[PDB]
């Protein structure tokens, strides 16, 4: 194949995206190019062989927090896709983690597939269309050189967990937690882009300590992690084909 | 607005829902990809006198063959809609479930006054209240005083039963309705500036016993019947109007 030249990474928090912008020298889009008037965040650059993007949901109109979960998520890969006609797509972000799957604090996991614990539709066929089970672009050189920890990430719009939740995410045996991922692989499924996953565990879903007040706690060091890793991805990346990974 | 409407969009989630709204008014399936090319969506398009009329679905998923039903898909085709199509208003039209205790009746078609989702559940503050996705529908005082639909919250989810923390939360927003797109169209319609209208068409009782399959195919004909029955009456109502006047 040809080698990759263009990267876009999607990112939930804006928190998240800034240690990487930095780290690259990016600078904020000022034109809009995804649409007029949208809260949408969008940060571009060049480095060595690869354009770099980066977009965010950014703040809520009226709230003014992040806007996060699956439906900005999936509008943002959608609109970045069709305006920039990337190489692969990056979600990068924080995640719950499974002690019992051997997750950590501060861990960044590569992603192997994908699934939704939250999109329940008790007919046949629907039921596998709302589980979502989609595979992340198979990375193995990228896998082995930076020695990356690899597990199922499940997505919902919740950050606690039901108990319809997690009696899905244990059936499908997920190590990872989330709010975006698998609407983010649906997109880049139907624009067939190349995507993968950088989840950073901020919080232990089967630990002791509440989810909410563990993941705020650990959100800045565990993205400083993330940005260090994604970094490494995009060097490694850097004059590669998507055969060499 | 004070100009007259020129364009409406139709976001219908299963094509059993558009089908008969598409043939009600002769609408032709676009040959030409509107939207972009290689993707499942299905436009129709027509005009009815003063008129336009498209209506949109994300059609079939290309791994299972079904109705790409939820509130992404929805999302997706609203916002790829809103931006090559510039509709002067949006309309989502669908079935739904609905509370017999919120006074819903089956083959009932709803107006809805304003939209929440269930199943954001974000517990830190001010990502709680963005959770809740609380959005109002475009006031049309005189349609509803014309058609003399019910009106009623809708509570949208990506799931077609209900958990006991989903029951929680409809009741806690006192929502007559559920369904599994609404909250994302109006997501959608807010971030685009573009006026958005629901007509809900109650297919199941979700606090009701259920039916016999004789009753299920009989009050799938009376909720279809009466769907694109309400669909081509506001379609008729809009014609020669501005915003201002509904
Ligand atoms: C403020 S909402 C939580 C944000 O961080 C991520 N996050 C990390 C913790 C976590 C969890 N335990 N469950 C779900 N999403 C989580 C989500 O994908 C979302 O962008
Ligand atoms: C095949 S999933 C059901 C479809 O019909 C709508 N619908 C029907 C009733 C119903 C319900 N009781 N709960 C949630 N969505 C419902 C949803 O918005 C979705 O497009």
Redesign the pocket.
């Known amino acids: 194949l040809r080698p990759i030249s263009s990267v876009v990474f999607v990112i939930?928090?804006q928190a998240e995206a800034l240690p990487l912008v930095n780290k690259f020298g990016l600078s904020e889009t000022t034109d809009s190019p995804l649409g007029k008037g949208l809260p949408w965040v969008l940060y571009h650059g060049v480095h060595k062989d690869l354009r770099i993007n980066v977009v965010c949901p950014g703040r809520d109109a009226a709230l003014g927090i992040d806007s996060?979960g699956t439906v900005p998520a999936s509008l943002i890969t959608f609109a970045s896709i069709q305006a920039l006609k990337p190489d692969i797509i990056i979600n990068a972000?924080?995640?719950?983690g499974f002690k019992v799957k051997g997750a950590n604090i501060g861990d960044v996991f590569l992603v192997s597939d994908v699934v939704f614990h939250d999109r329940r539709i008790p007919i046949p066929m629907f039921d596998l269309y709302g589980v979502g089970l989609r595979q992340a672009f198979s990375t193995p050189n990228l896998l082995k050189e930076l020695n990356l920890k690899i597990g199922r990430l499940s997505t919902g719009d919740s950050?606690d967990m039901s108990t319809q939740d997690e009696t899905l995410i244990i059936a499908n045996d997920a190590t990872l937690?989330?709010?975006?991922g698998a609407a983010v692989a649906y997109v880049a499924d139907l624009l067939k882009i190349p995507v993968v996953f950088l989840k950073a565990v901020?919080?232990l879903?089967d630990g002791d300590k509440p989810?909410a007040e563990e993941?705020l706690q650990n959100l800045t060091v565990v993205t400083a992690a993330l940005e260090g890793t994604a970094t490494k991805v995009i060097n490694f990346i850097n004059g590669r084909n998507l055969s060499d990974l």
Do not use: I, S, W
């Open positions: 939930a928090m996060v972000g924080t995640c719950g950050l937690k989330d709010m975006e901020t919080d879903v989810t993941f």
